[PDB]
C-alpha cells in the first residue's frame, strides 16, 4: 500500500500464505472452520518467526567466527511491547504480510491487536532497554540483553469508580511464540550459606541452589539481517529440593517465586528480600554465561572481549559477583581481579531523586549473600584508602563517600558501589549529567573526573515512527527517501520544506487521520465520545508527584472555571488526556488518578461546557497504547519540576510524531529546545537555578495561594467537595500536600504554566503556523534517535565500532 | 529391518528426513553443529507428530458429522509412558523413521531413550487407563480420556544406602511436544461458598473460582487412522485473584497447586483436602465440557449420547455434580435428573482392600462442596427408602448400605455413592467380581443384581508386544501374519507350532536376545553384573504387603541358606530381580525395599555363591523400565494372598512376553491358568476358601515358625542382624509383623511356594520343555488383550458397537 512497508512480491506473498496455512494446520492443530482470530494471530506470528530463524543462527554463528567484543546490557526491566509488527518492519515483510493475510480474507491490523505486550518494565528505564536492543542490532553490535523472564509483568490497570485497580498481567497464558527455551543452558544460582576461610582462600558453602533457565528472544536489526539475543532467566527448583512428600513438591514454588513478578515501582526503592533475590539471580546467571562464552574464544583480555552495562544500580551486584568469581573461583589476586572488573563494568544513572536510590540493609546482605558483603567491605576499605590519600584529613568526605552508610540500620549505597567499580558513569541527559557532578556525585567526580560522561537518551525511530505512524513516515519518505529510518539526522533536510504548501497540507492531514483513528479507538474499546477537531493535550507517563500531573489538573480546572465565568466567549476546544499507572502502594499517586477522573465527572457532564473541554483518563497506559495515542497528540506535556526528570523519553516520542511540547527546562527538554530553537517550544517555569533559590529561602505555597485568586478558587473547590459531592473531604490529602509539603513546587509554576498554555491555544487558532512549527520540531528530532545514543556508548564507553553493513541473508 | 515395523519407502524416508531438518532449523532453532541428542529427539518427535495432525482433525470432524454416542473415561490417573515409539507403531512409521534417522547418521533407539515417561499414574489403575485409550482408538470408539495434567507425576526413585529416596518427576522441564494447550476452552471450577435457598431452587454463591485449562494429547488407534483425545486439565488462577500487590500475585500458587502433583499412593486412601480438590476439579471441568459438546449436537437423550466411566471412586463426585447441573442449573426435576445420571454413569471397582476405600469426612465436604453434600444426603435418603421398602424391618441393612457412615467422624462412602448412582458396577477379574457380590457389596447386589458385571482387565498388545518385544512379534508374524496385533485371539493358531523345532528354537532365541540386551542395559546404566544364562526371576509392581515381596524375600534367603549348607551341589542359577516404588509415607513398604537390598548386599558378595544366585533391586520401576525387563523375564512372580489382587495386569504382560508364571489363585491369575491349562502354570498356595478357613480359626504364624526349621532359620537370621551387621535390629518391625500381625499370611504360603519354586527350577533344566510350556502360554494369552475388555465394556455397559474399519487417511 505505502512504500516504507516494503515490497509485496508475488513469490513472497504466495510463500507467506502457504506457510500460514501450514502453521494453522500443523502448529495450531486447527482448520479454517474452528480457527479464532487468536489462532490466526498465532499462525502469522509463527510465519514471521520463520524468517528470523536463518538470520538468528547465522548472526550467532558470525559472532563465533569473528569473535568481536561482546556487549552485555544488564537490566531488571525490558519494556518490549508487541513483537509482531516490529519484526515485520525490520524484515521488510509488512506489505507482503498485509497482502498475504488480505488474500486469506483476514485483517492484519485486527490480528496485531491480539498480541499481548511483553510488559517486563515500569516506564522510562525499561523502555530505554528495549530501544537500546533495537539500536544495538541495527548498528550490528554483538550485544545481548540479559534480564528476568517475569511470569507477571506490569499489572493491568482497571479504573473502578475512578480508582485504579490492579490485575495480574498473565502475558504467557496463551503462549509466547517469540521465545525459545534453552534448558540445556540452565545454571545454578546460590543463596544463603556461610563463608569458610581456608588455606586456599574463602569458600561459600551450605548454600541453597536455585536454577536459572534461559529463554532467548530474537532482536532483529533494521534491514541489516542482524538478529541479536535477549536472554531472560526463569527460576526453577532443583529436583532434590526439599527432598512430607506433597509439601516438599508444593514448596518448590518458594524458589520459583524469584522470577514470578516484576516489582511495579517507578523511581522508588522498596527494600524487600525478594527484590534482592531477583537482583542477584539475574547477575549470578548472566556472569556465569558471560564467562562461559569468554572461555570458549588470560583474564587480562576479559575487558577487551566483554563490556557489561549496568542499567541503574539494579544489577550492581555484578561488581562483587565478578570479583567473587575472579578471586574465589579463578584464583586471581585482588588487584588484578579489580582491574578487570573496573575495565569491564559501566554504570548508567537514571535519577537523582533520593527515594529511588538503592540502599540495602547490611543484615539482608549478611544473610542472603554473606560473601558479597565481605567483598563489598573490602572494596569500601581500599576505595576509602584512595580517598584518604587524595584528600588527607577530609574525614567528612570519607563519611560521605563510603559504600557503607552508618545510622539506625547500616545500609550499602549501591550507587557508590557502581561508581567505585565502573570505568564509566553516565547520566541520561546533559543537565542530568551536570547535576550528577555538581551535587550527588560531586565527591566522586573530584576523585575521578575521567569516569563521568553524558549519554543523552534516545528512542528507536523504528517502533516510534515507522511502526506507529506509517502515514508520517511515508510523507517524509516521499520527499527525502527512506535512509532516515536508520540515520535520523537526515530529518534536517525537512527544514527546506517548511514553506512548502503541499508538505504543510500533508503533515496536517496525517495528524488529522491519526486523531480520527484514535478518537474512533476510544469509542470502540472504551465507549467515550471526543471531538476530533479539538487540540489533543496529552500527558502520558507513570503517575508521580515529580511529573506534576497535578499541575495539569490545576490548568484543566482553570479552563473549566474560565468557561463558567464567561460561557459565551470563544476558547480553543481541547481534549485533555492523562494516562499512567501508579505504583500500587503509592497513595498520593492513587489520589491523583481519582482527582483526574473526578474532574472528568464534573467537566464532561456540564452542558455549558459543550465539546469545548473534555477530560479523559487513558486506562492501562502501556507501550501499545503509547503507539496509538502519541501519533494522535498535538501537545506533549512535559512539566516535571526542573531538576527531577533525569531525561524523559516520552518527550522525544512526541517530538518525532508531530506534537508541540509544553515543558520546563528539565531533562532532555533542554536539548530538544536547543535542537528545535526555543521559539519552537513552549518553555515555562523555574529553571534549576530558580528552584535552588526558592529552596534557600524556603517554599511557602500560602504566598501563591494568597496572591493568585484563580488558584485560591481551585483550592477552595477541592477542599469543599466541588469535585466530590458525596465525600466532601475526599481530596484533603491533595490540598494539604499542596499547601504544606509540596516537594515539587506545583504552585510556583502555576502562573507561568497557565499563561504559556494560552500561547499554545493562540497558535492552535492558526493551523498553518502551528504546522510550520511542528515541521521545525520533526526536522530537528534526529539527535533523539537511540542510534546516536548507542553509537556514543559504543565509541566512548564500550570501545567498539558501530556498523551499518548488512550481514548476508 | 523386521516386517511388523512397516515399510520404509523411498518417498516416505526422503520426506521424514526433510521434515526432520525443517524442525531442527525452524522449531528447535539449532543447526547440525550445536544439536544435542535431545534436540534430535525433539526434531523426530515433531516430525512424527506432524503425521498425527491430519488424522486428529479428520477424526474429531468425523465425530461431529456422525454424532455417535461419546464415551468419557474419567480417571485421576493416566500412566502413559513414552509416546514416540507408540505413535510410530500405530502409524506404521517405525521402519521409515529408523531408515530416515539412520541416513542422518543417528540411532533412533538412542533418541527414544531421551523421552520422559508421562508418569501420571501409580500402577495398575493408571496403566489400565492408558491401555484402554489405546484400545478405544483401535476399536474406533468416539472416546475421550479426561484427567489432570499434573506438573509432577510419580516421583523418581533413587536408592541411597539401600533406602528409597524420592525426587520430583519434573517431566515437563524440556517441554512436551505431544500436548496442545487449548486456552480457549478454559472453564471455571467453583469451591467453598455456601448454599442459598430461593423461590426457584438452591443457589451456590460466594465461591472461589479456579480455572481449568485443557491440554489435548492425541491417542492414535492401531493403523486405522483414528486419533482420539486425552484432555488433561491444568489449574490456573483468575486474574482478579487476591486482587499487598506482590503477595496477591504470589498467592496465585495456592489455586494452581490443585494440578501440581499426583498423590503417590497405590491402593491407599489419604483423606487430604488437596486430593478432594483434585477430584472435584477434574469432575467439574469435564462435566461442563461434556454438556457443552452435547448441547452442540432434551436431556432425555443425554444417556443415548453420553457414557461416563468412573475409574474407581476417584471421580465419584461426577454423580452429585451431574445432579447439581441438571437440578440447579438446567431446572430438571429430581427424579428425571436422577434417571439421566444413573443411565449415564458406570463404576469400575479396583480393590476390596479396606485401606483403599474412599471415605471422605463430612466436615471436609461441608466446607469445600456444601451443595454436593446436600445432594448426597438427598441421594442417601431416597436410596435408603428403596432399601426399606424392599427389605422391611431390616434396620441393619439400612446402616450397612448408607452412603453416610456414623462414628467418631461422619464419612461419605464414595463406593456406596457410585453403586447408587451408576447403572453398571464391574470388577476387574471374575474372582474379584464374585467377591464383590459375596462380600463387600452383597447388600447392593441383592437389591440390584442387574447392576453387577465382570470386565476382566487386559493390556494393549501394541505397547506390550509389538513395541517392547519386536523380535517375538516378528517370529509370530512369520508363522501366522500380522492380523493378531489387533485380534489377539489369533495367537491360538500358535498351538499348532508347539512341536515345531524351528519355532521352539526361535522363541528361545528371542528370549536369549532380550536377556542379553537387558543384562547389558543393567551394566551401562547401573554398573551391575548379571549372568545371562541364569533364570530371570522377576517381581515388578508397587511395593505392598498384600503383593508379598516378603514371600519372595523368604524364598531368596532359602536358596541362599541351601547353597551354604551344600556349596558343591548343583542348583539352577537365578537372577532374582525385584522392583517397585513404595508410597513415601508407607513405612513397611520402605522397610521391604531396604531388606531386598540388604539381602543383595549379603548374597551378591558371597564367593561361595558364585554367579549361582544374584539379587537385584530394579530402581525406578516405571512404564519404560517395564518395557525392557518384561521381555527379558523367564519367571513372573504373582504371589499376592488369594483375594487381595483384584486383577493385576503385570501378570498379563509377562504371559504375552514368554515368561512362565508362579502365582496364587488370585485375580486374573485364575483366568490365565484356565486359558493356558493349570499344567502350564506354577500355581501354589491357599485359595480364597483356605484363607477364610484360616481366618475363622485364627492365623497363628508361630505355628509355621515352630514346624518349619528352614523358616525358623530365616527369622533368626533377620532378628540377629545376619543381614544388617551394623544395625542388628534394623528389621525388628518386619520380624514382628510376620510373627504377630501379618494380614497377608506370608508364612502360610511359604512351604507350598518353596516347593513350587523347586518345580520351576526342574523344568528350567529342560530348555525344550520350558519353551514348549512358554509357547502354550503365549498362544492362550489372547483373552488378556484390552481390545477384548473394551469390546465388552462397549457392548454390555456403554451400548456402542466397536469397529475395525479404517477412517480414510
Ligand atoms: C520519586 C518519588 C517521590 C515521591 C514519592 C515517590 C514514591 C513512589 C512509590 O512508588 C511509592 C510507593 O510505592 C509506596 C510509598 O509508600 C511511597 C512511594 O513514593 C517517589
Ligand atoms: C492395601 C494396603 C494394606 C496395608 C497397608 C497399605 C498402605 C499403603 C500406603 O500407601 C500407606 C501410606 O502411604 C502411609 C501409611 O501410613 C500406611 C500406608 O498403608 C495399603
From Swiss-Prot, chains A, B:
Function: Allosteric enzyme that catalyzes the rate-limiting step in glycogen catabolism, the phosphorolytic cleavage of glycogen to produce glucose-1-phosphate, and plays a central role in maintaining cellular and organismal glucose homeostasis.
Residues modified as Phosphotyrosine: 192, 215, 445
GO MF annotation list: glycogen phosphorylase activity; nucleotide binding; pyridoxal phosphate binding
Keywords (A to Z) from UniProt: Acetylation, Allosteric enzyme, Carbohydrate metabolism, Glycogen metabolism, Glycosyltransferase, Nucleotide-binding, Phosphoprotein, Pyridoxal phosphate, Transferase
EC number in record: 2.4.1.1
Binding-site residues for AMP, renumbered to this chain: 31, 64, 292-297
PTM sites of type N6-(pyridoxal phosphate)lysine: 653
Highest classification ranks of the organism: Eukaryota, Metazoa, Chordata, Craniata, Vertebrata
Example GO biological process: glycogen catabolic process
Name of this chain's protein: Glycogen phosphorylase, muscle form
Amino acid at each position: 500500500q505505502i512504500s516504507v512497508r516494503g515490497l509485496a512480491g508475488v513469490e513472497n506473498v504466495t510463500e507467506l500464505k502457504k506457510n500460514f496455512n501450514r502453521h494453522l494446520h500443523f502448529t495450531l492443530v486447527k482448520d479454517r472452520n474452528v480457527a479464532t482470530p487468536r489462532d490466526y494471530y498465532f499462525a502469522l506470528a509463527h510465519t514471521v518467526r520463520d524468517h528470523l530463524v536463518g538470520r538468528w543462527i547465522r548472526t550467532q554463528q558470525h559472532y563465533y567466527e569473528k569473535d568481536p567484543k561482546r556487549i552485555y546490557y544488564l537490566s531488571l526491566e525490558f519494556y518490549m511491547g508487541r513483537t509482531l509488527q516490529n519484526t515485520m518492519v525490520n524484515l521488510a515483510l509488512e506489505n507482503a504480510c498485509d497482502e498475504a493475510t488480505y488474500q486469506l480474507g483476514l485483517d492484519m491490523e485486527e490480528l496485531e491487536e491480539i498480541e499481548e505486550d511483553a510488559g517486563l518494565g515500569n516506564g522510562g528505564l525499561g523502555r530505554l532497554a528495549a530501544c537500546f536492543l533495537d539500536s544495538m542490532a541495527t548498528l550490528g553490535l554483538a550485544a545481548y540483553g540479559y534480564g528476568i523472564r517475569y511470569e507477571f509483568g506490569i499489572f493491568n490497570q482497571k479504573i473502578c469508580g475512578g480508582w485504579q485497580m490492579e490485575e495480574a498481567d498473565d502475558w504467557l497464558r496463551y503462549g509466547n511464540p517469540w521465545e525459545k527455551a534453552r534448558p540445556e543452558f540452565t545454571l545454578p544460582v546460590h543463596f544463603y550459606g556461610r563463608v569458610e576461610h581456608t588455606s586456599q582462600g574463602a569458600k561459600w558453602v551450605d548454600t541453597q541452589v536455585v536454577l536459572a533457565m534461559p529463554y532467548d528472544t530474537p532482536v532483529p536489526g533494521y534491514r541489516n539481517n542482524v538478529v541479536n539475543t535477549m536472554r531472560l532467566w526463569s527460576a526453577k527448583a532443583p529436583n532434590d529440593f526439599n527432598l512430607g512428600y506433597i509439601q516438599a513438591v508444593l514448596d518448590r514454588n518458594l524458589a520459583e517465586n524469584i522470577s514470578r513478578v516484576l516489582y511495579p515501582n517507578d523511581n522508588f526503592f522498596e527494600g524487600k528480600e525478594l527484590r534482592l533475590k531477583q537482583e542477584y539471580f539475574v547477575v549470578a546467571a548472566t556472569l556465569q554465561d558471560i564467562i562461559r562464552r569468554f572461555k570458549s574464544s588470560n583474564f587480562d583480555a576479559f575487558p577487551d572481549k566483554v563490556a557489561i552495562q549496568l542499567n541503574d544500580t539494579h544489577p550492581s551486584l555484578a561488581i562483587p559477583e565478578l570479583m567473587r568469581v575472579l578471586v574465589d573461583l579463578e584464583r586471581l589476586d585482588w588487584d588484578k581481579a579489580w582491574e578487570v572488573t573496573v575495565k569491564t563494568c559501566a554504570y548508567t544513572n537514571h535519577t537523582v531523586l533520593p527515594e529511588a536510590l538503592e540502599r540495602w540493609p547490611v543484615h539482608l546482605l549478611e544473610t542472603l549473600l554473606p560473601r558479597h558483603l565481605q567483598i563489598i567491605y573490602e572494596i569500601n576499605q581500599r576505595f576509602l584508602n584512595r580517598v584518604a590519600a587524595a584528600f588527607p584529613g577530609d574525614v567528612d568526605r570519607l563519611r560521605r563517600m563510603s559504600l557503607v552508610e552508618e545510622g539506625a540500620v547500616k545500609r550499602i549505597n549501591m550507587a557508590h558501589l557502581c561508581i567505585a567499580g565502573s570505568h564509566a558513569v553516565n547520566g541520561v541527559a546533559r543537565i542530568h549529567s551536570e547535576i550528577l557532578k555538581k551535587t550527588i556525585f560531586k565527591d566522586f567526580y573530584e576523585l575521578e573526573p575521567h569516569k563521568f560522561q553524558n549519554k543523552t537518551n534516545g528512542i528507536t525511530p523504528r517502533r516510534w515512527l515507522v511502526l506507529c505512524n506509517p502515514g508520517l513516515a511515508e510523507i517524509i519518505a516521499e520527499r527525502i527517501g527512506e535512509e532516515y529510518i536508520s540515520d535520523l539526522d537526515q530529518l534536517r533536510k525537512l527544514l527546506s520544506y517548511v514553506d512548502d504548501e503541499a508538505f504543510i497540507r500533508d503533515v496536517a492531514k496525517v495528524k488529522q487521520e491519526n486523531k480520527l483513528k484514535f478518537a474512533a479507538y476510544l469509542e470502540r474499546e472504551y465507549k467515550v465520545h471526543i471531538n476530533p477537531n479539538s487540540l489533543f493535550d496529552v500527558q502520558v507517563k507513570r503517575i508521580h508527584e515529580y511529573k506534576r500531573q497535578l499541575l495539569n489538573c490545576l490548568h484543566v480546572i482553570t479552563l473549566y472555571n474560565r468557561i463558567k465565568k464567561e460561557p459565551n466567549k470563544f476558547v480553543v476546544p481541547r481534549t485533555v488526556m492523562i494516562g499512567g499507572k501508579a505504583a500500587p502502594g503509592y497513595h498520593m499517586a492513587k489520589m491523583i488518578i481519582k482527582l483526574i477522573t473526578a474532574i472528568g465527572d464534573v467537566v464532561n457532564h456540564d452542558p455549558v461546557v459543550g465539546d469545548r473541554l473534555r477530560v479523559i483518563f487513558l486506562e492501562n497506559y502501556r507501550v501499545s497504547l503509547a503507539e496509538k495515542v502519541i501519533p494522535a497528540a498535538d501537545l506533549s506535556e512535559q512539566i516535571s519540576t526542573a531538576g527531577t526528570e533525569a531525561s524523559g523519553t516520552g518527550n522525544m516520542k512526541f517530538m518525532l510524531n508531530g506534537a508541540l511540547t509544553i515543558g520546563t527546562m528539565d531533562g532532555a527538554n533542554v536539548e530538544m529546545a536547543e535542537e528545535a530553537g526555543e521559539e519552537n517550544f513552549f518553555i515555562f517555569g523555574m529553571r534549576v537555578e530558580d528552584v535552588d533559590r526558592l529552596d534557600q529561602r524556603g517554599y511557602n505555597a500560602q504566598e501563591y495561594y494568597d496572591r493568585i485568586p484563580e488558584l485560591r478558587q481551585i483550592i477552595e473547590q477541592l477542599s469543599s467537595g466541588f469535585f466530590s459531592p458525596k465525600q466532601p473531604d475526599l481530596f484533603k490529602d491533595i490540598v494539604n500536600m499542596l499547601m504544606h509539603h509540596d516537594r515539587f513546587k506545583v504552585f510556583a509554576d502555576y502562573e507561568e504554566y497557565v499563561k504559556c498554555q494560552e500561547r499554545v491555544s493562540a497558535l492552535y487558532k492558526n493551523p498553518r503556523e502551528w504546522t510550520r512549527m511542528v515541521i521545525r520540531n520533526i526536522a530537528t528530532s534526529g539527535k533523539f534517535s537511540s542510534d546516536r545514543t548507542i553509537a556514543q556508548y559504543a565509541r566512548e564507553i564500550w570501545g567498539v565500532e558501530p556498523s551499518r553493513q548488512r550481514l548476508p541473508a
